[PDB]
């Protein structure tokens, strides 16, 4: 199947004496595997998945040096944007970056990403050609022109087609057994009266990993849409996740409704019903 | 632009020396490099933000100061013989792969005794009649002698404008004795250009010695940085 | 040391191709710029290449990168006297600090093809008895003798080019702390 790697980076300037907070998080197939935070007592890239313990000290040393360079880069970039937008000096501002690659099972690069946001809005992004830029506003045109003149896209293209692909491959080899790990959801239905002869049926899934999951309600073989509510999938805090989905139904008809739970850990989807 | 000051410095051993650099690139990173006999670019100190500095690879004997974004100075509190070298400032945007933009360099000589600093005698030898006759060319030869240290630049000026065609200058001053260097250059023109009395030829030797910062006692010439020229007019002889 | 650059200096005949090479130790290095430094000036970026490429060309300059042997080179076609300069290779990984080689001093010289060597004496008119010796128009092969005596000085081959016409020439100068010397033997 496909695979992905991403580095999500944030620098947040602070109105006082402190330099910007800089954080970088790496993901392989959407699982956090490394992290750097400038606010840590000893700021350094750290392993966040067991399988990253295969890398020697030089890996962590040189990645750490890289983060230190990025931190300066973000500091300079924040200061430049503050001038481009004519913003006041004593505020707080957020610059973010997403970078990485999607790979096929044949290890072909399917798509490279290199994009930024300022104050929560898209700022600039490298196009799919890995050669040209899309700039969202006036300030970003300044950046675009600057990067066009210095040939910046070529450097990101090199990263995305070379290192990004090659290191993702290495990480998948080292992380294979752990990346395949699943915990199946445990499911049950709860029954909660509400006014005018109606009841909420809430279908729960608990203790599952990874977070991806689908819950559906059905009646008489048709999947439902109205009277329905889903909560965002949420961590339990112990590395597993939780979700529920609910439907409002007529009192006396509850047992006609069935919930289905779809999750990769399961040998097949769960189907269940209120069982009083 | 990245501009260094001074262009040349002669200092006493144990004296204080400050080399300055000013950049108008609005760059955050600034650097000081050392180059020895035209080789190497060795990082002494650098700085990635106004008002702070970082130790480079060969920091010892040197301090740096970054009082503003534009300015980065290299400070030698107690100059030693071994700090005789050429020093280059640079700037860059962020660092890493971003291009370094360099100043034009500062030559430093550190000496035990500044009484040895001496400007050149500049002599212009006129072309041989045998060359003019046999080859329809006229080679003028300029010789600068008796100078110390070797911070000299020789240029030729024809009719008030600097020329580069027809010139070859020695790349390296020749050491004649402990405290005495010599340098030569030649300018070759056609016989008839030399034979024209309207043509003016000038060898200019730029000597870099002491500056205004140096105090000098009462009775003798201060061997300051200065231009010294020798000249000749063409003639139909 | 991580970037190895040889030779210290090299001469190439005008119109020839100069080949400058460097080697590096860190196989992860992925950005390789060359800087050119002309006498009395600072280094300036000449050309650069990323490790995903084999070559980069700009006018008469080409850089070549060979990952397998960890070698970088710079080729200059139709070498001009104006290409005389120190060339620095360099390498780095990522955003790490640049590592420079020690630099190769390149001098491009004409190979003179109709040599008529001669020796002349010249006089300084602002002097009593001061003279020097000029050895000019000799061929690019021969070694200019060096002084076999304290008190007399002979300079190295110095090539000039009167771009007024087509007339390059090798020359060298000698002078002494005396008029006991004579130009007609000092040069051979």
């Amino acid at each position: 199947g496909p695979h992905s790697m991403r580095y999500f980076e944030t620098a947040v300037s602070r109105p006082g004496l402190e330099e910007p907070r800089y954080i970088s998080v790496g993901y392989v197939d959407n699982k956090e595997f490394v992290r750097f935070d400038s606010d840590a007592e000893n700021p350094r890239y750290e392993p966040r998945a067991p399988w990253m313990e295969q890398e020697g000290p030089e890996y962590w040393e040189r990645e750490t040096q890289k983060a230190k360079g990025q931190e300066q880069w973000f500091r300079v970039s924040l200061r430049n944007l503050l001038g481009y937008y004519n913003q006041s000096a004593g505020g707080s501002h957020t610059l973010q970056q997403m970078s990485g690659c999607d790979l096929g099972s044949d290890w072909r690069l399917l798509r490279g990403y290199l994009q930024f946001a300022y104050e929560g809005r898209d700022y600039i992004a490298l196009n799919e050609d890995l050669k040209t830029w899309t700039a969202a506003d006036m300030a970003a045109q300044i950046t675009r022109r600057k990067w066009e003149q210095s040939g910046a896209a070529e450097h990101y293209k090199a990263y995305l087609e070379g290192e990004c692909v090659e290191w993702l491959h290495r990480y998948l080899k080292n992380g294979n057994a752990t990346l395949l790990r699943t915990d199946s959801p445990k499911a049950h239905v709860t029954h909660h009266p509400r006014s005018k002869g109606e009841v909420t049926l809430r279908c729960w899934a608990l203790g599952f990993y990874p977070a991806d999951i689908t819950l559906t309600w059905q009646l008489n073989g048709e999947e439902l849409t109205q009277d329905m509510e889903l909560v965002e999938t949420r961590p339990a805090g112990d590395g597993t996740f939780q979700k529920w989905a609910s439907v409002v139904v007529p009192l006396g008809k509850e047992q006609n409704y069935t919930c289905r739970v779809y999750h990769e850990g399961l040998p097949e989807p769960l189907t269940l019903r209120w069982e009083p | 632009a990245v501009t260094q000051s001074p262009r040349s410095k002669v200092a006493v051993t144990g004296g204080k020396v400050t080399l300055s650099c000013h950049q108008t690139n609005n760059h955050d990173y600034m650097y000081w490099y050392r180059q020895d006999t035209g080789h190497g670019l060795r990082l002494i100190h650098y700085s990635y933000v106004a008002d702070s500095t970082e130790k480079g690879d060969i920091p010892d004997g040197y301090k740096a100061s970054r009082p503003s974004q534009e300015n980065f100075s290299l400070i030698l509190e107690l100059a030693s013989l071994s700090q005789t070298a050429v020093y280059f400032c640079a700037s860059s945007d962020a660092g890493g792969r971003n291009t370094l933009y360099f100043g034009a360099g500062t030559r430093l000589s550190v000496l035990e005794d500044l009484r040895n600093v001496t400007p050149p005698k500049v002599s212009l030898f006129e072309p041989s009649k045998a060359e003019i006759a046999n080859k329809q060319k006229a080679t003028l030869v300029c010789l600068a002698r008796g100078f110390f240290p070797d911070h000299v630049e020789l240029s030729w000026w024809v009719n008030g404008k600097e020329v580069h065609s027809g010139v070859c200058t020695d790349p390296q001053a020749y050491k004649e004795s402990n405290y005495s260097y010599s340098l030569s250059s030649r300018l070759r023109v056609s016989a008839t250009f030399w034979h024209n009395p309207r043509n003016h030829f000038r060898c200019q030797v730029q000597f870099h010695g002491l500056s205004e910062e140096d105090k000098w006692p009462e009775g003798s010439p201060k061997p300051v940085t200065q231009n010294i020229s020798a000249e000749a007019w063409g003639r139909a002889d | 040391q991580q970037v190895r650059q040889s030779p210290q200096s090299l001469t190439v005949w005008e119109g020839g191709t100069t080949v400058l090479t460097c080697s590096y130790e860190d196989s992860t290095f992925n950005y390789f710029p060359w800087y050119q430094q002309f006498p009395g000036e600072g280094p300036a970026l000449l050309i650069s290449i990323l490790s995903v490429s084999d070559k980069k060309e700009d006018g008469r300059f080409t850089t070549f990168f060979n990952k397998r042997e960890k070698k970088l080179s710079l080729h200059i076609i139709d070498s001009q006297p104006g290409d005389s300069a120190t060339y620095f290779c360099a390498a780095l990984y990522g955003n790490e600090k640049i590592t420079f080689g020690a630099g190769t001093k390149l001098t491009i010289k004409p190979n003179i093809q109709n040599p008529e060597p001669a020796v002349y004496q010249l006089k300084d008119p602002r002097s009593q008895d001061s003279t020097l010796c000029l050895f000019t128009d000799f061929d690019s092969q021969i070694n200019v003798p060096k002084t076999m005596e304290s008190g007399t000085f002979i300079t190295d081959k110095c090539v000039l080019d009167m771009k007024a016409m087509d007339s390059k020439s090798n020359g060298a100068i000698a002078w002494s702390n005396q008029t006991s010397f004579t130009c007609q033997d000092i040069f051979k």
Binding site: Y7, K66, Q70, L95, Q97, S99, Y159 | D93, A94, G96 | -
Partner: peptide, 9 residues
């Protein structure tokens, strides 16, 4: 491994 950004914004 992470990107090492080139020219600043």
């Amino acid at each position: 491994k992470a990107p090492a950004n080139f020219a600043t914004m």
